[PDB]
UniProtKB/Swiss-Prot annotation:
Induction note: Constitutively synthesized.
Keyword DNA-binding: no
Function comment: Molecular chaperone implicated in a wide variety of cellular processes, including protection of the proteome from stress, folding and transport of newly synthesized polypeptides, chaperone-mediated autophagy, activation of proteolysis of misfolded proteins, formation and dissociation of protein complexes, and antigen presentation. Plays a pivotal role in the protein quality control system, ensuring the correct folding of proteins, the re-folding of misfolded proteins and controlling the targeting of proteins for subsequent degradation.
Maturation and modification: Acetylated. ISGylated.
EC primary class: hydrolase
Key words, A-Z: Acetylation, ATP-binding, Autophagy, Cell membrane, Chaperone, Cytoplasm, Hydrolase, Isopeptide bond, Lysosome, Membrane, Methylation, mRNA processing, mRNA splicing, Nucleotide-binding, Nucleus, Phosphoprotein, Repressor, Spliceosome, Stress response, Transcription, Transcription regulation, Ubl conjugation
Species of origin: Bos taurus (Bovine)
Positions spanned in the full protein: 4 to 381 of 650
Biological process, per Gene Ontology: chaperone cofactor-dependent protein refolding; clathrin coat disassembly; mRNA processing; negative regulation of DNA-templated transcription; protein refolding; protein targeting to lysosome involved in chaperone-mediated autophagy; RNA splicing; synaptic vesicle uncoating
Modified residues (Phosphoserine): 150, 326, 359
Name of the protein in its database record: Heat shock cognate 71 kDa protein
Membrane topology of the entry: Peripheral membrane protein
Amino acid sequence: GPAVGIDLGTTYSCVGVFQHGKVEIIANDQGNRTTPSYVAFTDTERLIGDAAKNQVAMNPTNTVFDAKRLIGRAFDDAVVQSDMKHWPFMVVNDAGAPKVQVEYKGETKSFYPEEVSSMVLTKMKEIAEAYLGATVTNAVVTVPAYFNDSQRQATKDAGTIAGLNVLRIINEPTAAAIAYGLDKAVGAERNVLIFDLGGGTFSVSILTIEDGIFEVKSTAGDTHLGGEDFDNRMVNHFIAEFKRAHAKDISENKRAVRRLATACERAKRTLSSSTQASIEIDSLYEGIDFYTSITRARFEELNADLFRGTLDPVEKALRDAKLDKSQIHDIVLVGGSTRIPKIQKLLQDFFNGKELNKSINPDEAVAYGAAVQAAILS
Ligand SMILES: Nc1ncnc2c1ncn2[C@@H]1O[C@H](COP(=O)(O)OP(=O)(O)O)[C@@H](O)[C@H]1O
Ligand SMILES: [Cl-]
Ligand SMILES: [Cl-]
Ligand SMILES: [K+]
Ligand SMILES: [K+]
Ligand SMILES: [Mg+2]
């Protein structure tokens, strides 16, 4: 005690603690309220979180991410086989179970998805401990509503391995609803829609709540649609631009491309608050610095189809839950990408002006709710 709530995300993780009737989303050593779900291995050290993602551009082969896409799955799993082709790191088969293989201290090593995730959870545990100044043992860890028993078990084992006593594994959409106090009873059932657009995945969940009891009515989405896909649309736009100004194509320079992606990710976040953003990279390619800018309008155009497409899963979820737009009582935004003004307009317009629950940072909502539940179960 106190117990913490941890959002073990696909690309970022977040930890919160409920004290004095208030949730505190804890900042890490670098002052960030969310931490990259990354782990890197080098000749001399093991890096986790910011430290790991900061050097991803120079060490692509031994920097692991997306462990959540593998957790709880068999090697023969069709999604595992498809995802592997896209990762810069190796995934090997050990007795039918996937393991990421990397070089660490000059030796080849392999880790199960739950081991990689235990490293991320340990980082989150220490982040909470640095803030509380006390040991953290109990925690509630969240998982996507569609996770099966094996995936839930593997996520719980990741916690155990990190030295945490997992009080319970709860669904991400439910945690988000708890963050907004939507689990209080005041009569009949309420239908809540969770629009979750993160860095790597997208999901829409319709829940029915009555007497503090949740019932997942339907789920929809795209496990391969996230903010990183919006960053890629920007990267290509600028590769084309750097090519025009300098008659040089940087596409085959993996590092330059990853560094440009990072600059775009940062510009994108700025565009959610401002109408323009400046990109300034020193020595991008062959010593040439890239100093340019991009407007919100242009950013939105480069992603118009992807943004608009988020509405299909919304219609399907409603259809499968056998509900009409009008029957949705609350709409909750989760995922850092839901901070994009154009996405809020699309969703809002689709729901004919209905207001969105968005006062809690979308990329913090899951951790926020998990922290509340952790205190309750504690
Ligand atoms: N202010 C923002 N505007 C636009 N996108 C954001 C903002 N903040 C975070 N994001 C995006 O949210 C994504 C990842 O964070 P979330 O917190 O969404 O992580 P996860 O993918 O693990 O659920 C990234 O694509 C990131 O760029
Ligand atoms: Cl840290
Ligand atoms: Cl629009
Ligand atoms: K997250
Ligand atoms: K998501
Ligand atoms: Mg998420």
